């Protein structure tokens, strides 16, 4: 008990704002998470409007309203449970918990929609506590009284705007000077809720054994208000005379019987039924279907008979019970939905829990369950216990001006009326001390900068200019001055911030964002995708034009935070808004495997530059644009020798020549000019470090060194052999183009001609794919693939029939297959000239010949014999492309 | 005339499909662009439904409907004019013209919404030409006749579904076997439109001089149909007897007068007015306001008097004119909008124009003007010429079953009835030969692959399986079987593809996409933003749930083309969908200036590796994460010496050590490990080529070489001086950290302490910004900036007062300013030890000291005297950061 005393002194229903985030006993799941979440859910819709929803919509449709609204908040509490298990759970509120997991763009768009929903929540709680006062506590204490009979609907709006504005400016002064006394009353406001709920269930159990005696006065079908008179008779007997009652005086003109009366009043008789017959009676089968009506309609009972009258009716003057608002299904969804909001109250105390990754998912989910049980039990127990003609009666006009849910309670009706008065004034205090702390945390965070001032506070950190904005926004909801019109506006901001929490958790799971690994057990991305789809479907049931207003407000807060966050960082905004997009997309790719399922060439094309720096072989850019049809990566890297300290004047000239080609050749790519100490070295740096992160090259395209025997070129010729060794060590493909000056431009178009492929052995996967990619371009469009294979295996048939079903897997059987069959330096170059005689026998005049390229020698002294093997192999051919690669999958 | 004969033989209203794009006299603006665009605009709404819109909505609101719908298509024809002036104007249709400018994602989403809108356009034209046949040509030739009086609304739907299905399967057989004879009739279908428009304006001019004699038969206010009887009298006189007419037989029970009659028929008398009084009479002031009614209501006249009757009414049995559908404002917008669609018909002949960049913007804009003049002139001339009780009459029941717009025409009513019959059958043929060519072009384009088969054709290239899909989609619009319900579905797909054309042209202008430079004069991005906003506002006026269906269909076609286009290219789809995002964002940045307005450090941090490769100074990553708070670019580059051929085993070990730090240090960055021939060279390649494109580093962070005198390190020490020369030649900032082992980690937190800045001269812009960025991190959060300056200028006051207003511009006046005042190798190092005595006098125990760094020597023989100047300057300080840079703006 001594340990249970300082725990209840430690209880508070407040969000940890910005002062708990700058400085960054311990609570449990029950006091830290469960009780603050349950206090912010059970509110004013249960006591004022729930019996009216069960009456108008019936038991079946109002069971469907609660099943949809409690599922949108259950699937959102699973998305909040994924955020609460990811990472460290930073101290201070639910704003810092969301915005560190989902980033500042989703964090600020949720935070400003949760600020606007909390502000109009304080407007609904102030309009709710005036409605309890002026209807049930002291109805005579109203300034603007109706001067005539039809003034009741107009003069009640004037009492709401006068008393609501005077309550709001008084509520804000208590928060500004006495907020420490508001926080001590956090346990009193919980006890007013819990004792009111127990008084309802105590009255339902008592209503089965003996129902209470409440009479409801009927006349035909229609139901008449009990405010003026007391007795339900047309006439009685006093002092030996047939005297008329006070019900006679309201319909008939004079108190005397013979003068004048209403036409409907004469032909029908006054029936007196019981209002709360109990759970023993079978009224549950009666009030099970909907009774939607227009405004001003009567509140009728199905059983009692009446006779219709064609005489005219002004029902406002006579004492009747009339429907105030024209009700629908979509209207009752919008009025009910603020009764389930309060998910985010479970993570107000993220810095004061001993295990926040375990307390936050457990306490919020157990709070949605225990409140959805209360709303689903009350709908069954209001329909089965109250006559449905009393449930259709807002403002309790049939019950002498008493609260309908209060007459059901056992000890007194004053338990609920006092209990709903203090807990609604208390929820207005929490909505007006909790929403300025949220705006101050967003303002001091710096992500939205026009709102920077709202981050000023007092010496202890309490908001000053954030209160003044919140009172002015909450004043516009009091000027609407009805509880039923603020509630669809309120529901629209909570459904909007629940939409982004479910969207951002589903996108970051699919797109594999780094630092998003939620270790919560019952979480799957479809369960947030389904929560996004249901909280979007409820958002267009309520109002479709409130939904487009909320999606355009919150969508423009999202893009404004991107623009100012990139203007702050990468210099200019238009330029910076693409540099943050490229950085954030490359950090996602940083984790995965280098190759997954398919191969496609991503080429580093090497250019040679001469003195008076111009491109030596410009058609090597033309051939790159024919493989890559303006789609993939293309790094254009070239190397000039010398130190960077003195040759950076020539490096600015040579780079402008490369940009001149890539505009004309329509190469949509990148340029990496490097000034290296030797031309050998700088090609070995572009092989291993051209391109950062996910986008790195995959293939190296070169040109054949034509001048084989020269003076200074024997250093430059040897660089060709050692860069074959570099690409095979880095596991990269290599493409050598011979006679690259006689390659087609982009404007030349071949007619007829043939592309000959010679798959001997070793990586025919790439070697079929390269002419298939050329064939899609308009230069190589009308050509034919001939694919040739030499045979040293005995049979040629199963060579061919397996090869013809290689293209059945590859969908390119338009090619035709043919098989041709017939000390180291002696053995190598003799095999070349035998194979040379084979290849020009079938490919003398072809447009392009593809060949496998042999591996470079390992001893390094045979690099002149390896190059003579390649020259003898390729004699008298117009266009040769030599292909080799290492370790890749073509499917 | 001889030149005007082969031009009209060259005229055709067809889109150039895929066969004109594969092979890739000349027409002008008038025949090539203007006439095909005008033929596809003037259609069936002008003849069937325009007089009913003017009657129901009045002249003022229907002037507003045409002003909104012709502005959505005028602002879209300016966005199509920006596409037509960009680039080369590729041959073949409007699909290839849009998708080469806006990319394959916007191109395929527009193309499939323009395919679905063209298919339901063929369903409206077939339901339109059955309605002309069964109402005005032969009303007796109908299969399902109404068995009783109330069967007319139900049996007409059965005639639409039977005749519409038999027309659709017959229309598709003509296209499949005889499409060359359909294309020869393209000039006949234009002449049926133009001769019908001229017959209307010939009748309006004739109606001012003498109006025609058409009687309309009234009885009280309500208007009765003229189908059965002929004469508007209740009784007449024949063979010396008061005989009753045939109007008497339809209301009264028997032909005899005394038997029984209707109650409304007796008390009111039969009035006969003129139906088309002319432009001379002032009916224009009468039918100027709206008359929206419910279904089944009467068609009444304001002037004539009547007496009301309270007896019951079944108006369906008696001969009356009744409103068929309940009309609104939002209903008439959806019915009118298919009368303005046809912008895209101007660019059907992009391959057959002599100047396509000039013809396409001129001919489409002049076609929107000349049709918006026709619809705005007809509304004024229908209201001012036809009595409004005839305009509210669909199906011409008051006018003996004649067409209302046809009775206004001069030569005959049969000019319009025959003319609207052939041009509506002709628009159904063009909608059924033009929509399968569009689907075949999308299918053969390969951007959406589940639809690949639909690209098969005949030998000449005509679609086969694309016809069969189009008939099945057009069959579902005939099963709706009303002209007024297909038209909001039709309008929803055209407004959706006009929404993307206006959106994609506005985004690519703002975000500065490469290869988007439209050289059209009257184009601004706000004029496409305004066209996006109006074609979105019309899209929710028509139906809000048809609008959400079209935005979710077209939004999921957009993301499906992104996913399959990245799965095709970059291997895996999830991985590839981020690599296309990074490539496309870096090609936008490729064009602009390198620095625009502000500076922020984007750092290449250099790591040294020892033998048994581990990071020598791990806190140099910790200090980078405190400047960049997880926001900017961070390249982590390190160099190990040796050839890549043998040390790529150790390069895989050393790279895994770098990834171990960057996970723990929370560095969200990139790793560039380079194996170089010497450690001097590989640092000079990371300075100039680390990072591709827009995201390139800006600052180099190093560590001080502590071991100054060693054995092998005199080569490694000299690399420090020459990399100061490299960063100043590349115009990059440089940061040298001394005693980097004693730097704080991310978890250490300083309490108190001071950051001392010593701005002597030369780039105090960076030197104030560096401790301001550190101060925002939680390590350096509670510190103070002291900023010191030596003075060799005489006065210290205007030094300080200008310096204190340097921070008034920089918003960081929390710092305090203080001024301290008092053969080459003799002159250099004496100045160091004087300045050394100054700096430790004020900064002996500070947490971080910032200093300017002097320029490196030019002669290269003083690199040992430059390093001794830096060591004497920094004696006995715990944490020193030396700062220098070149050529940058800090605002
Ligand atoms: C309304 O109720 C009364 C009794 O509650 C019905 O009965 C009549 O009461 C009058 C007394 O004023 C008697 O004179 C009649 O003989 C009663 N009629 C009976 C018993 O059939 C009265 O009929 C009801 N009014 C209706 C149905 O319009
Ligand atoms: C109760 O009685 C009335 C007539 O005495 C029933 O009839 C309806 O009366 C309203 C007038 O307020 C009309 O608008 C409806 O059209 C009437 N409905 C009919 C004639 O079916 C009324 O339905 C009864 N209430 C019930 C049965 O709940
Ligand atoms: C409808 O029109 C007639 C004349 O077109 C109105 O005039 C009456 O006609 C009858 C002939 O059947 C005469 O006996 C009456 O004397 C006429 N009344 C006059 C001239 O005032 C007739 O009144 C009209 N019906 C109405 C207004 O209900
Ligand atoms: C023509 O006359 C009728 C009555 O003779 C006018 O009155 C309306 O009648 C309809 C019945 O179809 C009612 O629904 C309306 O409420 C009546 N309107 C009233 C009483 O104002 C009718 O308005 C007249 N038509 C006109 C003036 O265009
Ligand atoms: Cl509530
Ligand atoms: Cl909430
Ligand atoms: Cl049309
Ligand atoms: Cl169009
Ligand atoms: K609540
Ligand atoms: K049209």
mmCIF file with all atom_site columns, C-alpha atoms in Angstrom, chain A residues 532-657:
data_model
loop_
_atom_site.group_PDB
_atom_site.id
_atom_site.type_symbol
_atom_site.label_atom_id
_atom_site.label_alt_id
_atom_site.label_comp_id
_atom_site.label_asym_id
_atom_site.label_entity_id
_atom_site.label_seq_id
_atom_site.pdbx_PDB_ins_code
_atom_site.Cartn_x
_atom_site.Cartn_y
_atom_site.Cartn_z
_atom_site.occupancy
_atom_site.B_iso_or_equiv
_atom_site.pdbx_formal_charge
_atom_site.auth_seq_id
_atom_site.auth_comp_id
_atom_site.auth_asym_id
_atom_site.auth_atom_id
_atom_site.pdbx_PDB_model_num
ATOM 1   C CA . UNK A 1 532 ? -4.406  2.750   -44.580 1.00 0.00 ? 532 UNK A CA 1
ATOM 2   C CA . UNK A 1 533 ? -7.275  1.538   -46.758 1.00 0.00 ? 533 UNK A CA 1
ATOM 3   C CA . UNK A 1 534 ? -9.850  1.531   -43.965 1.00 0.00 ? 534 UNK A CA 1
ATOM 4   C CA . UNK A 1 535 ? -8.844  4.918   -42.570 1.00 0.00 ? 535 UNK A CA 1
ATOM 5   C CA . UNK A 1 536 ? -9.137  6.241   -46.133 1.00 0.00 ? 536 UNK A CA 1
ATOM 6   C CA . UNK A 1 537 ? -12.548 4.640   -46.635 1.00 0.00 ? 537 UNK A CA 1
ATOM 7   C CA . UNK A 1 538 ? -13.873 6.172   -43.412 1.00 0.00 ? 538 UNK A CA 1
ATOM 8   C CA . UNK A 1 539 ? -12.445 9.483   -44.534 1.00 0.00 ? 539 UNK A CA 1
ATOM 9   C CA . UNK A 1 540 ? -14.769 9.640   -47.571 1.00 0.00 ? 540 UNK A CA 1
ATOM 10  C CA . UNK A 1 541 ? -17.768 8.225   -45.726 1.00 0.00 ? 541 UNK A CA 1
ATOM 11  C CA . UNK A 1 542 ? -17.765 11.212  -43.321 1.00 0.00 ? 542 UNK A CA 1
ATOM 12  C CA . UNK A 1 543 ? -17.399 13.973  -45.927 1.00 0.00 ? 543 UNK A CA 1
ATOM 13  C CA . UNK A 1 544 ? -15.692 13.791  -49.299 1.00 0.00 ? 544 UNK A CA 1
ATOM 14  C CA . UNK A 1 545 ? -14.833 17.486  -49.473 1.00 0.00 ? 545 UNK A CA 1
ATOM 15  C CA . UNK A 1 546 ? -13.460 17.608  -45.960 1.00 0.00 ? 546 UNK A CA 1
ATOM 16  C CA . UNK A 1 547 ? -11.283 14.691  -47.077 1.00 0.00 ? 547 UNK A CA 1
ATOM 17  C CA . UNK A 1 548 ? -9.897  16.521  -50.107 1.00 0.00 ? 548 UNK A CA 1
ATOM 18  C CA . UNK A 1 549 ? -9.211  19.556  -47.942 1.00 0.00 ? 549 UNK A CA 1
ATOM 19  C CA . UNK A 1 550 ? -7.241  17.465  -45.456 1.00 0.00 ? 550 UNK A CA 1
ATOM 20  C CA . UNK A 1 551 ? -5.271  15.641  -48.147 1.00 0.00 ? 551 UNK A CA 1
ATOM 21  C CA . UNK A 1 552 ? -4.340  18.914  -49.840 1.00 0.00 ? 552 UNK A CA 1
ATOM 22  C CA . UNK A 1 553 ? -3.369  20.628  -46.585 1.00 0.00 ? 553 UNK A CA 1
ATOM 23  C CA . UNK A 1 554 ? -1.238  17.726  -45.354 1.00 0.00 ? 554 UNK A CA 1
ATOM 24  C CA . UNK A 1 555 ? 0.193   17.028  -48.800 1.00 0.00 ? 555 UNK A CA 1
ATOM 25  C CA . UNK A 1 556 ? 1.405   20.620  -49.044 1.00 0.00 ? 556 UNK A CA 1
ATOM 26  C CA . UNK A 1 557 ? 2.942   20.477  -45.576 1.00 0.00 ? 557 UNK A CA 1
ATOM 27  C CA . UNK A 1 558 ? 4.886   17.441  -46.805 1.00 0.00 ? 558 UNK A CA 1
ATOM 28  C CA . UNK A 1 559 ? 6.321   19.162  -49.871 1.00 0.00 ? 559 UNK A CA 1
ATOM 29  C CA . UNK A 1 560 ? 7.059   22.371  -47.985 1.00 0.00 ? 560 UNK A CA 1
ATOM 30  C CA . UNK A 1 561 ? 9.230   20.509  -45.477 1.00 0.00 ? 561 UNK A CA 1
ATOM 31  C CA . UNK A 1 562 ? 11.123  18.838  -48.335 1.00 0.00 ? 562 UNK A CA 1
ATOM 32  C CA . UNK A 1 563 ? 11.736  22.170  -50.036 1.00 0.00 ? 563 UNK A CA 1
ATOM 33  C CA . UNK A 1 564 ? 12.976  24.039  -46.968 1.00 0.00 ? 564 UNK A CA 1
ATOM 34  C CA . UNK A 1 565 ? 15.042  21.078  -45.811 1.00 0.00 ? 565 UNK A CA 1
ATOM 35  C CA . UNK A 1 566 ? 16.877  20.979  -49.127 1.00 0.00 ? 566 UNK A CA 1
ATOM 36  C CA . UNK A 1 567 ? 17.220  24.744  -49.389 1.00 0.00 ? 567 UNK A CA 1
ATOM 37  C CA . UNK A 1 568 ? 18.853  24.678  -45.957 1.00 0.00 ? 568 UNK A CA 1
ATOM 38  C CA . UNK A 1 569 ? 21.384  22.023  -46.913 1.00 0.00 ? 569 UNK A CA 1
ATOM 39  C CA . UNK A 1 570 ? 22.320  21.773  -50.593 1.00 0.00 ? 570 UNK A CA 1
ATOM 40  C CA . UNK A 1 571 ? 22.433  25.469  -51.416 1.00 0.00 ? 571 UNK A CA 1
ATOM 41  C CA . UNK A 1 572 ? 19.641  26.242  -53.922 1.00 0.00 ? 572 UNK A CA 1
ATOM 42  C CA . UNK A 1 573 ? 16.244  24.564  -53.435 1.00 0.00 ? 573 UNK A CA 1
ATOM 43  C CA . UNK A 1 574 ? 15.360  23.301  -56.939 1.00 0.00 ? 574 UNK A CA 1
ATOM 44  C CA . UNK A 1 575 ? 18.874  21.890  -57.233 1.00 0.00 ? 575 UNK A CA 1
ATOM 45  C CA . UNK A 1 576 ? 18.870  20.676  -53.651 1.00 0.00 ? 576 UNK A CA 1
ATOM 46  C CA . UNK A 1 577 ? 15.525  18.935  -53.971 1.00 0.00 ? 577 UNK A CA 1
ATOM 47  C CA . UNK A 1 578 ? 17.051  16.538  -56.504 1.00 0.00 ? 578 UNK A CA 1
ATOM 48  C CA . UNK A 1 579 ? 20.263  16.009  -54.528 1.00 0.00 ? 579 UNK A CA 1
ATOM 49  C CA . UNK A 1 580 ? 18.362  14.858  -51.446 1.00 0.00 ? 580 UNK A CA 1
ATOM 50  C CA . UNK A 1 581 ? 16.364  12.554  -53.701 1.00 0.00 ? 581 UNK A CA 1
ATOM 51  C CA . UNK A 1 582 ? 19.516  10.977  -55.109 1.00 0.00 ? 582 UNK A CA 1
ATOM 52  C CA . UNK A 1 583 ? 21.184  10.586  -51.718 1.00 0.00 ? 583 UNK A CA 1
ATOM 53  C CA . UNK A 1 584 ? 18.175  9.018   -50.041 1.00 0.00 ? 584 UNK A CA 1
ATOM 54  C CA . UNK A 1 585 ? 17.690  6.544   -52.884 1.00 0.00 ? 585 UNK A CA 1
ATOM 55  C CA . UNK A 1 586 ? 21.327  5.437   -52.797 1.00 0.00 ? 586 UNK A CA 1
ATOM 56  C CA . UNK A 1 587 ? 21.365  4.738   -49.069 1.00 0.00 ? 587 UNK A CA 1
ATOM 57  C CA . UNK A 1 588 ? 18.592  2.181   -49.532 1.00 0.00 ? 588 UNK A CA 1
ATOM 58  C CA . UNK A 1 589 ? 20.706  0.222   -52.006 1.00 0.00 ? 589 UNK A CA 1
ATOM 59  C CA . UNK A 1 590 ? 23.794  0.247   -49.740 1.00 0.00 ? 590 UNK A CA 1
ATOM 60  C CA . UNK A 1 591 ? 22.786  -2.949  -47.884 1.00 0.00 ? 591 UNK A CA 1
ATOM 61  C CA . UNK A 1 592 ? 21.595  -5.532  -50.411 1.00 0.00 ? 592 UNK A CA 1
ATOM 62  C CA . UNK A 1 593 ? 23.451  -8.099  -52.507 1.00 0.00 ? 593 UNK A CA 1
ATOM 63  C CA . UNK A 1 594 ? 25.411  -6.862  -55.551 1.00 0.00 ? 594 UNK A CA 1
ATOM 64  C CA . UNK A 1 595 ? 23.556  -9.028  -58.083 1.00 0.00 ? 595 UNK A CA 1
ATOM 65  C CA . UNK A 1 596 ? 20.232  -10.749 -57.510 1.00 0.00 ? 596 UNK A CA 1
ATOM 66  C CA . UNK A 1 597 ? 18.531  -12.233 -60.586 1.00 0.00 ? 597 UNK A CA 1
ATOM 67  C CA . UNK A 1 598 ? 19.407  -10.740 -63.986 1.00 0.00 ? 598 UNK A CA 1
ATOM 68  C CA . UNK A 1 599 ? 22.298  -9.133  -65.848 1.00 0.00 ? 599 UNK A CA 1
ATOM 69  C CA . UNK A 1 600 ? 22.240  -5.992  -67.977 1.00 0.00 ? 600 UNK A CA 1
ATOM 70  C CA . UNK A 1 601 ? 25.415  -4.076  -68.938 1.00 0.00 ? 601 UNK A CA 1
ATOM 71  C CA . UNK A 1 602 ? 26.176  -0.876  -67.015 1.00 0.00 ? 602 UNK A CA 1
ATOM 72  C CA . UNK A 1 603 ? 29.150  0.421   -68.895 1.00 0.00 ? 603 UNK A CA 1
ATOM 73  C CA . UNK A 1 604 ? 32.276  2.437   -68.140 1.00 0.00 ? 604 UNK A CA 1
ATOM 74  C CA . UNK A 1 605 ? 33.454  3.568   -71.577 1.00 0.00 ? 605 UNK A CA 1
ATOM 75  C CA . UNK A 1 606 ? 37.142  4.485   -71.674 1.00 0.00 ? 606 UNK A CA 1
ATOM 76  C CA . UNK A 1 607 ? 38.179  7.338   -73.964 1.00 0.00 ? 607 UNK A CA 1
ATOM 77  C CA . UNK A 1 608 ? 41.704  8.079   -75.086 1.00 0.00 ? 608 UNK A CA 1
ATOM 78  C CA . UNK A 1 609 ? 42.805  11.681  -75.473 1.00 0.00 ? 609 UNK A CA 1
ATOM 79  C CA . UNK A 1 610 ? 45.692  12.906  -77.608 1.00 0.00 ? 610 UNK A CA 1
ATOM 80  C CA . UNK A 1 611 ? 47.764  16.054  -77.348 1.00 0.00 ? 611 UNK A CA 1
ATOM 81  C CA . UNK A 1 612 ? 45.633  19.127  -78.116 1.00 0.00 ? 612 UNK A CA 1
ATOM 82  C CA . UNK A 1 613 ? 43.016  17.193  -76.221 1.00 0.00 ? 613 UNK A CA 1
ATOM 83  C CA . UNK A 1 614 ? 40.226  15.797  -78.370 1.00 0.00 ? 614 UNK A CA 1
ATOM 84  C CA . UNK A 1 615 ? 38.550  12.415  -78.400 1.00 0.00 ? 615 UNK A CA 1
ATOM 85  C CA . UNK A 1 616 ? 40.539  9.884   -80.392 1.00 0.00 ? 616 UNK A CA 1
ATOM 86  C CA . UNK A 1 617 ? 37.635  7.536   -81.235 1.00 0.00 ? 617 UNK A CA 1
ATOM 87  C CA . UNK A 1 618 ? 34.309  9.405   -81.055 1.00 0.00 ? 618 UNK A CA 1
ATOM 88  C CA . UNK A 1 619 ? 32.244  6.470   -82.339 1.00 0.00 ? 619 UNK A CA 1
ATOM 89  C CA . UNK A 1 620 ? 32.833  4.618   -79.078 1.00 0.00 ? 620 UNK A CA 1
ATOM 90  C CA . UNK A 1 621 ? 30.189  6.891   -77.555 1.00 0.00 ? 621 UNK A CA 1
ATOM 91  C CA . UNK A 1 622 ? 27.901  6.133   -80.487 1.00 0.00 ? 622 UNK A CA 1
ATOM 92  C CA . UNK A 1 623 ? 28.113  2.395   -79.860 1.00 0.00 ? 623 UNK A CA 1
ATOM 93  C CA . UNK A 1 624 ? 27.327  2.866   -76.171 1.00 0.00 ? 624 UNK A CA 1
ATOM 94  C CA . UNK A 1 625 ? 24.088  4.686   -76.977 1.00 0.00 ? 625 UNK A CA 1
ATOM 95  C CA . UNK A 1 626 ? 22.991  1.721   -79.109 1.00 0.00 ? 626 UNK A CA 1
ATOM 96  C CA . UNK A 1 627 ? 23.399  -0.853  -76.317 1.00 0.00 ? 627 UNK A CA 1
ATOM 97  C CA . UNK A 1 628 ? 21.938  1.367   -73.608 1.00 0.00 ? 628 UNK A CA 1
ATOM 98  C CA . UNK A 1 629 ? 18.898  2.996   -75.211 1.00 0.00 ? 629 UNK A CA 1
ATOM 99  C CA . UNK A 1 630 ? 19.098  5.982   -72.876 1.00 0.00 ? 630 UNK A CA 1
ATOM 100 C CA . UNK A 1 631 ? 18.220  3.898   -69.845 1.00 0.00 ? 631 UNK A CA 1
ATOM 101 C CA . UNK A 1 632 ? 21.040  2.596   -67.706 1.00 0.00 ? 632 UNK A CA 1
ATOM 102 C CA . UNK A 1 633 ? 24.182  3.921   -66.162 1.00 0.00 ? 633 UNK A CA 1
ATOM 103 C CA . UNK A 1 634 ? 26.943  5.204   -68.417 1.00 0.00 ? 634 UNK A CA 1
ATOM 104 C CA . UNK A 1 635 ? 30.172  6.580   -66.951 1.00 0.00 ? 635 UNK A CA 1
ATOM 105 C CA . UNK A 1 636 ? 32.409  8.246   -69.542 1.00 0.00 ? 636 UNK A CA 1
ATOM 106 C CA . UNK A 1 637 ? 35.865  8.101   -67.977 1.00 0.00 ? 637 UNK A CA 1
ATOM 107 C CA . UNK A 1 638 ? 39.106  9.289   -69.526 1.00 0.00 ? 638 UNK A CA 1
ATOM 108 C CA . UNK A 1 639 ? 42.634  9.793   -68.224 1.00 0.00 ? 639 UNK A CA 1
ATOM 109 C CA . UNK A 1 640 ? 45.338  12.295  -69.064 1.00 0.00 ? 640 UNK A CA 1
ATOM 110 C CA . UNK A 1 641 ? 48.815  11.940  -67.616 1.00 0.00 ? 641 UNK A CA 1
ATOM 111 C CA . UNK A 1 642 ? 50.691  14.448  -65.463 1.00 0.00 ? 642 UNK A CA 1
ATOM 112 C CA . UNK A 1 643 ? 50.283  16.088  -62.083 1.00 0.00 ? 643 UNK A CA 1
ATOM 113 C CA . UNK A 1 644 ? 46.990  17.836  -61.292 1.00 0.00 ? 644 UNK A CA 1
ATOM 114 C CA . UNK A 1 645 ? 48.816  20.928  -59.977 1.00 0.00 ? 645 UNK A CA 1
ATOM 115 C CA . UNK A 1 646 ? 49.851  22.198  -63.407 1.00 0.00 ? 646 UNK A CA 1
ATOM 116 C CA . UNK A 1 647 ? 47.567  20.359  -65.849 1.00 0.00 ? 647 UNK A CA 1
ATOM 117 C CA . UNK A 1 648 ? 44.234  21.449  -64.383 1.00 0.00 ? 648 UNK A CA 1
ATOM 118 C CA . UNK A 1 649 ? 44.055  24.074  -67.117 1.00 0.00 ? 649 UNK A CA 1
ATOM 119 C CA . UNK A 1 650 ? 44.092  21.330  -69.748 1.00 0.00 ? 650 UNK A CA 1
ATOM 120 C CA . UNK A 1 651 ? 41.708  19.211  -67.684 1.00 0.00 ? 651 UNK A CA 1
ATOM 121 C CA . UNK A 1 652 ? 39.093  21.943  -67.971 1.00 0.00 ? 652 UNK A CA 1
ATOM 122 C CA . UNK A 1 653 ? 39.563  22.037  -71.740 1.00 0.00 ? 653 UNK A CA 1
ATOM 123 C CA . UNK A 1 654 ? 39.373  18.271  -72.204 1.00 0.00 ? 654 UNK A CA 1
ATOM 124 C CA . UNK A 1 655 ? 36.258  17.948  -70.058 1.00 0.00 ? 655 UNK A CA 1
ATOM 125 C CA . UNK A 1 656 ? 34.392  20.452  -72.235 1.00 0.00 ? 656 UNK A CA 1
ATOM 126 C CA . UNK A 1 657 ? 35.186  18.308  -75.275 1.00 0.00 ? 657 UNK A CA 1
#
